[PDB]
Design a protein around this ligand. Sequence first.
Ligand SMILES: [Mg+2]
Ligand SMILES: [Zn+2]
Ligand SMILES: [Zn+2]
Ligand SMILES: [Zn+2]
Ligand SMILES: [Zn+2]
Lengths: 100, 241, 159, 43, 56, 65, 94, 486, 171, 85
Amino acid sequence: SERACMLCGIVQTTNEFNRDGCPNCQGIFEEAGVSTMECTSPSFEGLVGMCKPTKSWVAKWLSVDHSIAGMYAIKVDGRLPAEVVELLPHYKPRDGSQVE
Amino acid sequence: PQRFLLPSVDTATIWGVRCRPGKEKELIRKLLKKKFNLDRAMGKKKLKILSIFQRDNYTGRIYIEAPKQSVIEKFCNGVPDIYISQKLLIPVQELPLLLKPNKSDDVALEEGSYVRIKRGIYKGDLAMVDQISENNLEVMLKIVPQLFNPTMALRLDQANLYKRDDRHFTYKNDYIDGYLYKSFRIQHVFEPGDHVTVINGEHQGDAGLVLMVEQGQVTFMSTQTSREVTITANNLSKSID
Amino acid sequence: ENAATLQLGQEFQLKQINHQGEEEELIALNLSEARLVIKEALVERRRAFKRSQKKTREKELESIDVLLEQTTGGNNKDLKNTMQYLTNFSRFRDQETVGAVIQLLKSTGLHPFEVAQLGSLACDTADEAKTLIPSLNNKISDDELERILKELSNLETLY
Amino acid sequence: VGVLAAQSIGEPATQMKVTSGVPRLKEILNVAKNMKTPSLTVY
Amino acid sequence: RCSFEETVEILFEAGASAELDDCRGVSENVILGQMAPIGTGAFDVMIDEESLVKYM
Amino acid sequence: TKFNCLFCNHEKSVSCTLDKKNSIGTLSCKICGQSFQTRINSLSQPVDVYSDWFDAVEEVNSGRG
Amino acid sequence: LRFGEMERDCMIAHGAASFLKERLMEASDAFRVHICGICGLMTVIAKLNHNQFECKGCDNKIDIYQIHIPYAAKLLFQELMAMNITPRLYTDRS
Amino acid sequence: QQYSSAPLRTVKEVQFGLFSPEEVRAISVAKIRFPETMDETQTRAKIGGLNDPRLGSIDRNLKCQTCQEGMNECPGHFGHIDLAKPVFHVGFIAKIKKVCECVCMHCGKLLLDEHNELMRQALAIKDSKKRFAAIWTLCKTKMVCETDVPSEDDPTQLVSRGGCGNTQPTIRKDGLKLVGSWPELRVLSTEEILNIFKHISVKDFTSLGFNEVFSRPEWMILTCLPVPPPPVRPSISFRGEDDLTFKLADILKANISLETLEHNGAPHHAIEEAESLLQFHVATYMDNDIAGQPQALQKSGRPVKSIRARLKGKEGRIRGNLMGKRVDFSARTVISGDPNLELDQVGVPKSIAKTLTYPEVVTPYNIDRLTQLVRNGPNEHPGAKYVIRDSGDRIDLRYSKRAGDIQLQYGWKVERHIMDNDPVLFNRQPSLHKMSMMAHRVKVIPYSTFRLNLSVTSPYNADFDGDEMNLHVPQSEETRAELSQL
Amino acid sequence: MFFIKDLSLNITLHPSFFGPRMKQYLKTKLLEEVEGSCTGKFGYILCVLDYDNIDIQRGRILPTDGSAEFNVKYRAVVFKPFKGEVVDGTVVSCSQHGFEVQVGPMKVFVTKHLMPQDLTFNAGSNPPSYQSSEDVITIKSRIRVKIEGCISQVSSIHAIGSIKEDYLGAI
Amino acid sequence: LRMKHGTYDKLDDDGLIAPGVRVSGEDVIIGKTTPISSKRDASTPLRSTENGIVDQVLVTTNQDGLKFVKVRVRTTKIPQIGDKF
DNA sequence: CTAGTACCTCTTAAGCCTCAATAAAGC
DNA sequence: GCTTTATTGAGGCTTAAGCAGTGGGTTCCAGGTACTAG
Ligand SMILES: [Mg+2]
Ligand SMILES: [Zn+2]
Ligand SMILES: [Zn+2]
Ligand SMILES: [Zn+2]
Ligand SMILES: [Zn+2]
């Protein structure tokens, strides 16, 4: 099964998350004192293969410009843990709630 | 922040390429792997492909962000199930809506609301939303199992039957008040004398002649019953005699 | 839409077609003339039935009722009600009176409906007549209207 | 009259140098802008 | 003309032009299943109310 | 008179005119304004002019003139 | 058996209009359809048990006429209606 | 076959005007929005969808809600589809292109007016087709609308025609959607064309040949597709919905998807693809065979059958069920020579005579003979098989054991076996000429082969080498008299 | 409204009834049809005159059926109310919402809101009646009212009227 | 609920007519019933225009093992006037 | 574990557009 | 005197048409694939 992170949208197999976790948000999850699984969801829509996040406008639109190249999800369902939200004052959910 | 993310010609350039429906995700993965292999092999000379993506609701097409068409044509050359010839330039004004997440058809879940289960052994059975997880990934649904009968369960499968409260029973791993509570994924869930007719309400299909109108309520004498009935104006339709 | 402003329907035109295809002017009749023609039709029906079979508000009503029962009686109860309505509050009882009334109305040359209403409906003042038929306002002179009204009132039968 | 004429003209065709027979009848019935074997007679 | 080789094109042309058919042709009556004005059907047969009485 | 261009990477923006009387093929783009001229024969076609222009551009880029 | 077109024209030549009418309307598919006198469309609501005739398209109460036509004729008319083509069946000559 | 109070009278004329969307909505009793042809459990038809009870009765034992009738008396009813995006009509695509070329793309006004002598000459043509062709030729000759036109009497002086001045693009015909060139080529929006057609004045399309009362240029652009009732799409038992039902379901699904996309954000990129798919589906439904375009393939291994195909040629309704249709009362079998038969007398097998019947009405003249025939029964050749009462109900004799106790009454009809001296039309399938179908007097014989006079072989072109001929029995006194006399 | 006009009626007759007396049967059927007829198109048919002068056109024989269709044209007087006309009738029944007035073959209803302020319903008399400062209304009374609306039924005609202008009401 | 005019008396307990049985018209040759969810008849009626004495009947298993039946009916045809030589 | 269930797959006749000359009007 | 016109027509490509009727025998109930209920 493939799960997409609710913070950066990176899509990876559950085994990778269990073994190494999110390569781009491991530090934030560790600081928040929450597991990777709780910060990832299995439901996502659309697939994006980002090759040059720094030079790609899509990455800026998805707020993954500083992330690494790989597979990301345009839309991810679910909510991050309250601890993660408190540590991210400018966090924007990827579920489309704030796309009015 | 989003006000500064408006696409521009000199900053955003995405081309659409037709593809066989049902292979969008596989094609995207294959293209990403090919791009990684080319970057690893060629070295300094790398094709100018910024991103490759697709939309589930828009089947049979993929989108590639590159500065020049020739780069996309070279990158996609020899890839099965992709029609490089059938390609069009995405206008800048259409770029936002392309990446705008689709409005999910699932109405905002609320406690006590009635929904229909899409996946599960209770397909086509009405359910009531009792509680929603803080992560908005699982929802508790109350459903009719016929109502659970503790007597029959005790008579038949007492081994797997447990009593937690006067009205709480556990059977085959939670029944309350004869209903089953189970966790399911969200993705898995006028003027007087006018002839009028009732289109909605308890008296649907009734026809009559209006006599009085006041405060949006129309009273009409019905031929079928020969009695005056008062109904909301919005639920009545003027029928030509 | 049909109203009193001469906006008749697609069929109530000022001209009518005849069985031979000739075009004639629409002709109306008053209550007395209607009763006369109905009585003539009943007499004709009675004569036809007889030949086929061969090989003061108290007495006239009974005769009319028995005549209706004898011919075209029992088919519908509405005919008796209409006959009673016509007879109870009729105005002219003599053929000569209705003949004179129609002859006088002919000279006016107005619309058949207007003359029929004038001969049937009763009016006593110019304002009442004008408000009764606002459409027929600038069509008949006040003096002519008064003269015809008083003539009709005088011609009324004393029962 | 029309149907009788049609039947009388069609029956010989079914029964059946210069083109003749069914091809000639088909050419005559059609506009026949191009002639397979055009001919002219002068006296 | 519909009964000929061109069937639907003629129907589209008539629809565009709102052509009116008098149903005097053989094909029209055949399609409508009515006695065409052909031979026996060309004329009509009526009843004389004056000759019948004397013939009795 | 429609062909692709390499300077602006725009398709169908190229037009080729073949003067057989003067035996000259002229290729012009309606977007970037690039103009090229070459010698042509009676049997020449716009594809030939496009190929000649592409070869000339490659030679100029390589610097082996 | 099939009543061929050639047989049809042979009978037409014979002049037996009555025979053709019977063959194509009695010995073959026979249908009775209701059409309004203003819109001339077969889409007429006719409850024979209730003896109620009314067409929703045109606000008419009693202007309906019954016509005996082959089922193929009404099938063709409905197919043309699907093509936005309306054969307006009228019982009078304009 | 039920009594009706409506007056009986044959059709005398048939107007062929277009079907307006407003008329579609007014007459469409029901609305179709569910692609599924049946509800859950495959027991009840989907409400407000395909095979809805309002349109008609899907299967026997159920009476149509609209008419409370079964299958015998159920013409059917149509449904109205929203079709938010207008769709070009495949049949009128050429007409749409001609009308667009004949009128301005902005003002929706005829390019030429009566000022031009050529336009006046073209309008003088009484025939609608030739006049429209001349107008189209003159319009395509022109390339730009002029606000002011020179005056014929004073060429120097000009009269304001009321136009704008916008150039008329050279409209092409490529694929379902036409492309116009001004040069830059662009696809003309269907909404713009519909608006232009709406802006056309009465005089314009009246001159073009469109009758305002029964037709309009806008009506050509279909904004609503009528749903054929169940009779037009019978369910074949194997329910087994026909290919037309599948095409309608596909069209409805496409419309639903387009509406959902519009209501859930319209990028305008995939909207064009959805609109093109809807247009293709509609065109295939109305005409599956489209020249120079792919043919829609049914889910099964066969091209989808469309109404245009169903009305194409011999297999179509026009030439397959109207010009020539199957017959009930008729027999076919081999013919053998018989010198001992009269010229007008044709031998008939006893079995064929028993199977074939004539509905003779009961009369005092032959009451005894009809009673004797009824007593004989269907098994015996000089008898009958069905008896028709005054009410019209038919009672069979073989299934009824009390046939001998039935007393015939005047006004009834009995299906008696064809007897001797009974006119019947004998024909050979190759009806080359008029004399290939002639009336003969039936002569019952105890053999399974038709027998006819030697001479009549020549008009029939028969040779008794296996020729099979057909015998048609008249079913009315009128038909018998016409056959005997004509 | 009391208009004389020519009406054409199509009558189907079985071929059996083609005796000398078939005209009598046709006339009887015509009488049974025209009398009591009430159609919105032609209004309500009142009477048919000139019975002895009725002319019947030659009957039409169906192409296959033996029935004869005769188109008989006859002059008849008919009644049809129009909006804005003023007619007089007799009260037939009383009700809280108003009193129905029989006029000719039709019924008229008066809206309560369009009644004189002085006029008021009263149930103290048997049957209930209406009392006015200067008028009296009962079941047996001739009342002249203006007709403002007309409703067409399958076999009936209804009128909606009011009494607001002067000289209206009991006379 | 689905019963045809074919006479089922000729059928034996097994449901197949044995050789030497007179069959004509719509008489059922093979008696098969398909369960419906109680069952609907699916017999193979004899040809209406052909009749004769059943010659042989055989029962076997198809490639998938399903029961399969084949019934051959033999008739004697004598020359008649309408026969072609 | 195992098996439902749906889902994506040869000879012409006219119309029209596209071609190469040609006499008049602009200028 | 030179330049630009509406006209003329001439062929390529295209979309259409393709005896009538009748009898019978064979084959389709479509392939794999993912997702999910018992
Ligand atoms: Mg032979
Ligand atoms: Zn360029
Ligand atoms: Zn209607
Ligand atoms: Zn129905
Ligand atoms: Zn304009």
